[PDB]
From a paper:
An example of a protein activated by PKA is the cystic fibrosis transmembrane conductance regulator (CFTR), an epithelial anion channel crucial for salt–water balance of the lung, intestine, pancreas, and sweat duct.
The sample, comprising 30 µM recombinant human CFTR purified in digitonin, 250 µM PKA-C purified from bovine heart (bPKA-C), and 2 mM AMP-PNP—known to bind and stabilize PKA-C but not support phosphorylation—is very heterogenous. The two PKA-C binding sites are spatially separated, appearing nearly orthogonal to each other when viewed from the cytosolic side of the membrane. Despite their distinct positions on CFTR, both PKA-C molecules are oriented with their N-terminal ends projecting toward the membrane. The presence of two distinct PKA-C binding sites on CFTR provides a plausible explanation for how the eleven widely dispersed PKA sites can all be phosphorylated. Mapping these positions onto the 1:2 complex structure indicates that nearly all phosphorylation sites are in proximity to one of the two PKA-C molecules. The results revealed a comparable distribution of the three CFTR/PKA-C complexes, suggesting that PKA-C binds to the two sites independently and with similar affinities.
Residue numbers in the entry:
A (entry chain A): 3 to 108, 118 to 402, 437 to 645, 844 to 886, 910 to 1121, 1125 to 1173, 1207 to 1436
B (entry chain G): 13 to 351
C (entry chain K): 13 to 332, 341 to 351
Write the structure that this text describes.
């Protein structure tokens, strides 16, 4: 069924499984369905079976939940099998330079060259398969890592479910979503690197026997300094994070109030504040980048001293042949590359794995929900002495409820005041602490909060059932669901998506009632099912099914409605969590009549990135000239020397390509500084552009994309991009310099090297398309798993009621396998790319070696040694090119976002009014006309409730609108929009408040006097409103000014508008937002101070606007005018 | 050990002696009643009767003489007739005598009206967490005692165990067993309790006994046996597959012994390698398993029968009849010399 | 030390002579007004009155003797009366006169125009850090002065702290206070101020006052109690755990000292190890907190109440046979 299962041994070694996959991918666009079938051994159901069996065996075995000790029994044999070849290949690569310790004598070396060439093939064979094997082990383990906790998700106790952090599990899942899988490559490196040192030390003592630990101590000191720099780097990052979060909060606040900001014309102040805040974060980031650059450069710089100090003692003591010098250079290169890189990375990987193991082992051990032992056989259920806490506080006051088998029970009282908890406890969601509950157990419940998963009508109705024609028809016809179904487009198979927005809240309640009705059980724990429908609809649903069909069976509906409460078989009213009265219907109705009555990646993109800041070009020119001059000087030195012992020692300066071509400390810092400066310039440009964008395109994009436009993209630009770009540039320069040095050795090298580079470029280009397609597909598919997890989290209670968890497990496994298919495909393609690149490099090295062998001792040694080192640099270079390709996506997104178009007396006259949200959308006005009276308010009446916010926005032209607005003789065209809109006074339903002290929050422009501000605030009723604030006026508006109430915020907005001295002021929804005293104070203040303005108070209720003198009646597509109520009340309202 | 090993030796010292002294023709069909018939049985008749001389209610098995010979299950009952004769274990009900007629045979065993738990669990669906353990402990004790007798049970079905007045379960129907030492190819019964080697058609061993009890326990916990298929061929294929999913409500600690019980590896079957019964005796899911105290039967029953008199067959769903008068010639009467 | 210790010795000396000659029945309810009820408080009634003979506004703490007997708090009331009648410290509003009627007893206190700081903190949410230190310094001063007399307050709630016209806080509610040297097994009061030692139902010493003051500072800066739960049993369990997360705005210097103040170890509690208050005085959170200069209270206050006359109740809220006379023989 799977193509990789139909693979030969040689085909498996070549990993050519994706060869037709690559053939299709480089030809045509990616198709998700075209993915090859998942491996049989890769089945989530299969692997999780063994994982769970081992976990259970261990959990029973001993008093220590050592999950690692169990998973060792699952994986250690394969881990050691891969590690054996891995360590063998490491040993081979380490020992290979010693074989070069023979050719230096120059006949016989031809066989040595053939063997050295074959060593590359053997090492590549040993290396390449191991990465894929260990990574397959990693992905296999991770699948079960998700699976075990996912199964435990249906096992947790609800009492801790309300306490367990919802985001903690999400973060736990996301943390190892990619880290733990890739963290296996360094696993055996512990078992190898110490052995690598053991071999290398013996090699050195074989060459020296007297200078061994001299360079080892320098290497250890370098490792110590490098590790020490990390603590300072982490401290700098931690310091930067808080200010970055504050800046993000301010930016999010600006994003939420973008329309109000455009109205207030505060873009300049917002930009100035954002830049001023970002200045300190930029300083911290520059310091951190300097530290990181020093740390990264230390590794490249170490190579000179690493050989120099090791050689200096032996060389001074006695003479040494240069052959051993080249050999020691190679040996030390290997020793350093392992000591400085392999050991710490492996230590970090192991520590992270151990910590994750501890966390996972702790998580699974939590106390689980105990299922009720029921469904055997029973008559009418009964309860006795119900008393327990929902978390002390007895949710039930020794309650008892004997429900007849067939009866229709009901209870009333305060909503969710423990009656819902009593229902949950009866259903088994809450363990009763007192008394003894007995029930048949087969019973459905209907939570007040509907949990609708995606799926068609049949899916929502079945939830693991067959298609019953009569039952489905009865459910539709009885739950008011047949008409709503007919209202659906397909009307039978409308596959619902995520969010449930396709249906109304009463539609969701009808869905809940139908879902409860779908299965027959001993009881139906209804919880206010009619809570979202009209009274007539509720009565119809009751008479049809709720009080007709299932009432013949035992039923318990939480209903407070008096009319149904009269017909109930028994009632139970509880107050303060305690049943005040209950029992038979007539008996309870007669025992207390008084209570009864009372209660009832383009090259153009890269060029634009380069062209952002001119300093980058100068820095690049300086670095390039420095590199070229250094290479030329090295070539001149080599030529002069090749055609007293200090001259021999100077050959070591050429011996290490890393130190010879190292980016000078006097050069690298300017590159990163320019990177940071260009990032800051880009941030400022993006902020300025976002301030001017037209609202029509702004509404088209979702607002959360505006947050994502800077939440991570700017961070990636600041941190990731500079380091990667600099490392790639330095590595490329070093490699190119090595190539030039080798070409200087003999006049044949370039003729072969050029085809190798061209083929490498072609191969990289071919691999790039498939790699990008696979990465995008895998990233896109990952979301559905979290979607299913969130759906399960939302529906947990209803799922526990349904008991059909197997289908949810099937869905989760299917999604996990679907993601795993793409992940394995991408990993395999990357492995094939790595193997092919290694083969190309090996071929080039072999050809160069043969050419040199056919061809002076120092030149041969230099060429061979440079060849002996270039491989790791080339691999890092390929990885860096891939990383740059990955990083360029954020820059492309930023450039696309910046590439946006900009937005572009009291008497007044409007005409030819055309408006819409988008270009050519719903016509908000049909050539509408209106006249503004001098100093008199116009009542926004008529079609109130059909939407007046659009007309209010059109008063400032904040929508896709065009027409005529001739106010005071001035037109809508001559004046700039920033100057034309200022005359209007905004009174939004939601007040926009900048988080900060009152002085800044009320005066963003900062062009007034403090005494005048205090005098106006006293005139605007804010002095007393501010006397209760911290200090006098410096009180920072934390949480969006959470201290201020809605009426206080309205007063603040009115005061700010009065300070702006606007000629107009359109009011909106005064009584809707204001409390009684707040509305009274607002009316007094407006009628006192703002008496001299041509206002427009928009009110849905005509009575609230009845005080207005003028009246502008609204109607669908025609905003009429009614000067006087003598005709307005008789024609517009009547 | 100590008393346990010596008790097994005491039982073994007497087992072969009565195995060496079979009885024959202990009674004739002239002192019984025809009150009712609890059930039919595989290929025979069975009636609930009352002792004419004493009054003690007792069962009366029956089967056609030709049925033994035609289907090749004649001596299969010949061994079982002796096997039941000597047994002495509290869990099972003994027998008094047997009939020897020229048309059919009869077995005079106890008549416990407690009936099969198969019907009670069809009316109940699934047994509670300790409820199943209460029976499974007696199953373990029975398995030990019987395996000590150098016999293969080959008989573990919900239709094989009944209930007593005090609430103790009891098995019967020794036809499927064989007191075998060594390898054998014999196989019979229903595939619902089929073992992989039994389907594999090789020399069987005492290993499948644990598998049958494990299948019984797993099905008792959920009602639905892990193997369920339309035909025995598909069921035999599922048995060969060896893959199954335990109940979601099942205990994980019980799930460990569940994985142990159905272990396909015949060499590594739970309680088969070296410990015998000790590994089961130490199983976590039987933490509250007082072996010797349940042997005294002092433990309260998780579900006791609602008995309504010795003649009451209310726990039975039978009221039917059957009759026969007299014949003149048995089918292979020479074959019936030890029955 | 020097002058400060010389003053502390004189205060301790004069307190004994004051305690040995307590007054009783200093006045009758015949020279007061009934303008408004300042509040209830605990289980009593508070009202704002004006001295008919002089004119000075004075508070009157009414309480039913039947309430004292039925609530089993009569000896605490007598101890509170004696301690208030003998107190001598600038940090607190003194008691002027005592009333003893056949229906209830009143206690004359000075008019507090600044009102309770709890309402002000609810109006402003969170105080500035120097604003917190400004009150905390005088709180530490008064607490150590109470240590200079060896008494246990056994009461610490946000509403009990008033504010003066000078801006200094005003202390009141001396009910749970008692002059007992050693350990006491009595337990009562607010759960939010319940130390684990009191929660454990053991002998309680003065050491719990440091935890109370630390909780006061932490909540004053945070606006939310460090220990909070829906039920008191869960609140008692959380307090017994002795773990709480510091706010994001919390400074390292203040939060580290709060860790020593909230240390579950009562022996290791700050202000009880060896030096009394010297380790607290040297703390960097009090780096600029002039203990001696605050004796004159000359520091510029973080905020001043908007006083508009003693008769204005703007800061205050706008709301609305003796039982066992043998027990009340010294009132
Ligand atoms: N000791 C007993 N007392 C009373 N009824 C009994 C007893 N043993 C069996 N029965 C009943 O007899 C009925 C059928 O007879 P049975 O002994 O099971 O013949 P069978 O062929 O061996 N059954 P089986 O092999 O499983 O198909 C059973 O349903 C029991 O209810
Ligand atoms: Mg049968
Ligand atoms: Mg049977």
């Amino acid at each position: 069924r799977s193509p990789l299962e139909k693979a030969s041994v040689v085909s498996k070694l070549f990993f050519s499984w994706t060869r037709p996959i690559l053939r299709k991918g480089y030809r045509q666009r990616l198709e998700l369905s075209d993915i090859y079938q998942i491996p049989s051994v890769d089945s989530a159901d299969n692997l999780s079976e063994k994982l769970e069996r081992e976990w259970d065996r261990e959990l029973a075995s001993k008093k220590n939940p050592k999950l690692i000790n169990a998973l060792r029994r699952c994986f250690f044999w394969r881990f050691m099998f891969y590690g054996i070849f891995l360590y063998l290949g490491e040993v081979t690569k380490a020992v290979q330079p010693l074989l070069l310790g023979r050719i230096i004598a120059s006949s016989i070396a031809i066989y040595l060259g053939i063997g050295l060439c074959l060593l590359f093939i053997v090492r590549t064979l040993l290396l390449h398969p191991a990465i894929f094997g260990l990574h397959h082990i990693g992905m296999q383990m991770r699948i079960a890592m998700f699976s075990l906790i996912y199964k435990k998700t249906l096992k947790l106790s609800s009492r801790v479910l309300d306490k367990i952090s919802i985001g903690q599990l999400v973060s736990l899942l996301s943390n190892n979503l990619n880290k733990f899988d890739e963290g296996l490559a360094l696993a055996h490196f512990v078992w190898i690197a110490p052995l690598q040192v053991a071999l290398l030390m013996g090699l050195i003592w074989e060459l020296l026997q007297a200078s061994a630990f001299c360079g080892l101590g320098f290497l250890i000191v370098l490792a110590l300094f490098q590790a020490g720099l990390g603590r300072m780097m982490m401290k700098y990052r931690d310091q930067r994070a808080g200010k970055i979060s504050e800046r993000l909060v301010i930016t999010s606040e600006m994003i939420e109030n973008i329309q109000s900001v455009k109205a207030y014309c505060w873009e300049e102040a917002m930009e100035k504040m954002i830049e001023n805040l970002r200045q300190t974060e930029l300083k911290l980031t520059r310091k951190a980048a300097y530290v990181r650059y020093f740390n990264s450069s230390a590794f490249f710089f170490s190579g000179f001293f690493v050989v120099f100090l090791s050689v200096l003692p032996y060389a001074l003591i006695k003479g040494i042949i240069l052959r051993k010098i080249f050999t020691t250079i190679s040996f030390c290169i290997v020793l350093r590359m392992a000591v400085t890189r392999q050991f710490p990375w492996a230590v970090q990987t192991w520590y992270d794995s151990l910590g994750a193991i501890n966390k996972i082992q702790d998580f699974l051990q939590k106390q689980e929900y105990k299922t009720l032992e029921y469904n055997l056989t029973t008559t009418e259920v009964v309860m006795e002495n119900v008393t327990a806490f929902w978390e002390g506080t007895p949710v039930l006051k020794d309650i008892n409820f004997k429900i007849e088998r067939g009866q229709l029970l009901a209870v009333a009282g305060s909503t969710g005041a423990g009656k819902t908890s009593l229902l949950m406890v009866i259903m088994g969601e809450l363990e009763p602490s007192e008394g003894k509950i007995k029930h048949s157990g087969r019973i459905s419940f209907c939570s007040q909060f509907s949990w609708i998963m995606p799926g068609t009508i049949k899916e929502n109705i079945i939830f693991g059932v067959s298609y019953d024609e009569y039952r489905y028809r009865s459910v539709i016809k009885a739950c008011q669901l047949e008409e709503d179904i007919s209202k659906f487009a397909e009307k039978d198979n409308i596959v619902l998506g995520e969010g449930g927005i396709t249906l109304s809240g009463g539609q969701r309640a009808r869905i809940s009632l139908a879902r409860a009705v779908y299965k027959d059980a001993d009881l139906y724990l209804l919880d206010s099912p009619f809570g979202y429908l009209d009274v007539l609809t509720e009565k119809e649903i009751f008479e049809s099914c709720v009080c007709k069909l299932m009432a013949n069976k035992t039923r318990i509906l939480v209903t407070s409605k008096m009319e149904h409460l009269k017909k109930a078989d028994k009632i139970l009213i509880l107050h303060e969590g305690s049943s005040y009265f209950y029992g038979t219907f007539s008996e309870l109705q007669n025992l207390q009549p008084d209570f009864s009555s009372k209660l009832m990646t383009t090259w153009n993109t890269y060029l634009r990135y380069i062209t952002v800041h001119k300093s980058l070009i100068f820095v690049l020119i300086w670095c390039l000239v420095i590199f070229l001059a250094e290479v030329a000087a090295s070539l001149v030195v080599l030529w002069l020397l090749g055609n007293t012992s200090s001259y021999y020692v100077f050959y070591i300066y050429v011996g290490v390509a890393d130190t010879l071509l190292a980016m000078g400390f006097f050069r690298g810092l300017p590159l990163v500084h320019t990177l940071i400066t260009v990032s800051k310039i880009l941030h400022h440009k993006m902020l300025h552009s976002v301030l001017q964008a037209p609202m029509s395109t702004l509404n088209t994009l979702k607002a959360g994309g505006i947050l994502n436009r800077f939440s991570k993209d700017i961070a990636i630009l600041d941190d990731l991009l500079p380091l990667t770009i600099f490392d790639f540039i330095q590595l490329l320069l070093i490699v190119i310099g090595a190539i030039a040095v080798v070409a200087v050795l003999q006049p044949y090298i370039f003729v072969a090297t050029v085809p190798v580079i061209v083929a490498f470029i072609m191969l990289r280009a071919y691999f790039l398309q498939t790699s990008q397609q696979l990465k995008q597909l895998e990233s896109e598919g990952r979301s559905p798993i979290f979607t299913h997890l969130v759906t399960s989290l939302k529906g947990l209670w209803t799922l526990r009621a349904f008991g059909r968890q197997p289908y949810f497990e099937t869905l989760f496994h299917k999604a996990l396998n679907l993601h795993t298919a793409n992940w394995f495909l991408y990993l395999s393609t990357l492995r094939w790319f790595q193997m092919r690149i290694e083969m190309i490099f090996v071929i080039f090295f072999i050809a160069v070696t043969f050419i040199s062998i056919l061809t002076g001792e120092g030149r041969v040694g230099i060429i061979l040694t440079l060849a002996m080192n270039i491989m790791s640099t080339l691999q890092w270079a390929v990885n860096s090119s891939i990383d740059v390709d990955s990083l360029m996506r954020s820059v492309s997104r930023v450039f696309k976002f910046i590439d946006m178009p900009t937005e572009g007396g009291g008497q007044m006259t409007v005409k030819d009014l055309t408006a819409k949200y988008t270009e050519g959308g719903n016509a908000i006005l049909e050539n509408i006309s209106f006249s503004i009276s001098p100093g008199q308010r116009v009542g926004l009446l008529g079609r109130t409730g059909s939407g007046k916010s659009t007309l209010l926005s059109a008063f400032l032209r904040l929508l896709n609108t065009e027409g005529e607005i001739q106010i005071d003789g001035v037109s809508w065209d001559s004046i700039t929009l920033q100057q034309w809109r200022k005359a209007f006074g905004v009174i939004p339903q939601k007040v926009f408040i900048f988080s900060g002290t009152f002085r800044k929050n009320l005066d963003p422009y900062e062009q007034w006097s403090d005494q005048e501000i205090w005098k106006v605030a006293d005139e605007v009723g804010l002095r007393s409103v501010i006397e209760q604030f911290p200090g006098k006026l410096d009180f920072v508006l934390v949480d969006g000014g959470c201290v201020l109430s809605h009426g206080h915020k309205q007063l603040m907005c009115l005061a700010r508008s009065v300070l702006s001295k606007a000629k107009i002021l359109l009011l909106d929804e005064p009584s809707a937002h204001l409390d009684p005293v707040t509305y009274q104070i607002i009316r007094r203040t407006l009628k006192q101070a703002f008496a001299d303005c041509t206002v427009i108070l928009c009110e849905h209720r005509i009575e609230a606007m009845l005080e207005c003198q003028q009246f502008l009646v609204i109607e669908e597509n025609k905003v009429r005018q009614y000067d006087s109520i003598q005709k307005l009340l008789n024609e517009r309202s009547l | 050990q100590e008393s346990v090993k010596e008790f097994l030796a005491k039982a073994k010292e007497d087992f072969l002696k009565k195995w060496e002294n079979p009885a024959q023709n202990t009674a004739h069909l002239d002192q019984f009643e025809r009150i009712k018939t609890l059930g039919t049985g595989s290929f025979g008749r069975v009636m609930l009767v009352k002792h004419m001389e004493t009054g003690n209610h007792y069962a009366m098995k029956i089967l056609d003489k030709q049925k033994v010979v035609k289907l090749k299950q004649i001596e299969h009952t010949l061994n079982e007739k002796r096997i039941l004769q000597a047994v002495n274990f509290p869990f099972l009900v003994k027998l008094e005598f047997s009939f020897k007629d020229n048309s059919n045979l009869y077995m005079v065993m106890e008549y416990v009206p407690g009936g099969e738990m198969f019907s009670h669990l069809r009316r109940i669906g699934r047994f509670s967490e300790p409820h199943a353990r209460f029976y499974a402990a007696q199953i373990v004790l029975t398995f030990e005692y019987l395996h000590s007798l150098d016999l293969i049970y080959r008989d573990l079905k919900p239709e094989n165990l009944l209930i007593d007045q005090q609430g103790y379960i009891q098995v019967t129907d020794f036809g499927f067993a064989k007191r075998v030492k060594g390898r054998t190819w014999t196989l019979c019964g229903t595939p619902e309790y089929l073992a992989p080697e039994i389907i594999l058609s090789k020399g069987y061993n005492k290993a499948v006994d644990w598998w049958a009890l494990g299948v019984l326990i797993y099905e008792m916990a959920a009602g639905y046996p892990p193997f369920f298929a339309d035909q025995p061929i598909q069921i035999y294929e599922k048995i060969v597959s060896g893959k199954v999913r335990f109940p979601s409500h099942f205990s994980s600690d019980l799930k460990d012994l569940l994985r142990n019980l159905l272990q396909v590896d015949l060499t590594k079957r739970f309680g088969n390698l070296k410990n015998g019964v000790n590994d089961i005796k130490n199983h976590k899911w039987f933490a509250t398993t007082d072996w010797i105290a349940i042997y005294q039967r002092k433990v309260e029953a998780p579900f006791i029968p609602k008995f309504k008199g010795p003649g009451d067959t209310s726990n039975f769903d039978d009221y039917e009849e059957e009759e026969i008068r007299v014949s003149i010639n048995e089918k292979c009467g020479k074959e019936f010399s030890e029955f």
